[PDB]
């Protein structure tokens, strides 16, 4: 059914499937590494529930087996969280909007500083390219379908991926971009996904080390972590 939708219909379905922007348990009436880590992991855990139900609404995802759905989410969950965070932070230069009540400088854990600058640089890149919401939801769906696709069934996924590629080009054509500009912008967007993968890998390593340190992760967040 995902193959039948038009480009505009693809966009609409993706926009309508968008998860909510959740709030943190952050209280500004108190200034630490352990507590900050707690806020972020707690937020990520509650977001994971919405992401799972968002994935079901991504065209073509329900056509996959339960095992394959589990695999794709296990592989791309941190990538999806990160591109969402980066998208939220576009209007806030030098800042990361984890939640509407949680907006952080790079000033505000160990090793987290590196990931922060990478997330900031990613947000700055999107701001420079003036990334559109219609393009964002396309990229996020691509991450879900592509990140674990190489780790019949793969033929359907690539077909949906091609459809999302069709959609991105259609959006850029409407924006007035020439054919050359469309290919270039398409490339620029997909190359960023390589950096998002990199940030996720680095984030996954730090998440495991924080786990072994036992400084506060949920059961779901741990199961997602053990899968990597």
């Amino acid at each position: 059914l995902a193959l039948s939708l038009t480009a505009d219909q693809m966009v609409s379905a993706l926009l309508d499937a968008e998860p909510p922007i959740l709030y943190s348990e952050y209280d500004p009436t108190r200034p630490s590494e352990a507590s900050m880590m707690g806020l972020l992991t707690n937020l990520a855990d509650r977001e994971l529930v919405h992401m799972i139900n968002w994935a079901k609404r991504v065209p073509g995802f329900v056509d996959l087996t339960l095992h394959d759905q589990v695999h794709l989410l296990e592989c791309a969950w941190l990538e999806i969280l990160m591109i969402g965070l980066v998208w939220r932070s576009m209007e806030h230069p030098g800042k990361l909007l984890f939640a509407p009540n949680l907006l952080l400088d790079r000033n505000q854990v160990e090793g987290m500083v590196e990931i922060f600058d990478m997330l900031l640089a990613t947000s700055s890149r999107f701001r420079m390219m003036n990334l559109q919401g219609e393009e964002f939801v396309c990229l996020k769906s691509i991450i879900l379908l592509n990140s674990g696709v190489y780790t019949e069934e793969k033929d359907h996924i690539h077909r949906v991926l091609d459809k999302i590629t069709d959609t991105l080009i259609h959006l850029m054509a409407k924006a007035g971009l020439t054919l050359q500009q469309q290919h270039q912008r398409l490339a620029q967007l997909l190359l960023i996904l390589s950096h998002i993968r990199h940030m996720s890998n680095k984030g996954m390593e730090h998440l495991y080390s924080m786990k072994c340190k036992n400084v506060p992760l949920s059961d779901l967040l741990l199961e997602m972590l053990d899968a990597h």
Binding site: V70, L73, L220, E223
Partner: peptide, 9 residues
């Protein structure tokens, strides 16, 4: 497995 179950419900 939580992810397994949440994908069902």
């Amino acid at each position: 497995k939580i992810l397994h179950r949440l994908l069902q419900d």
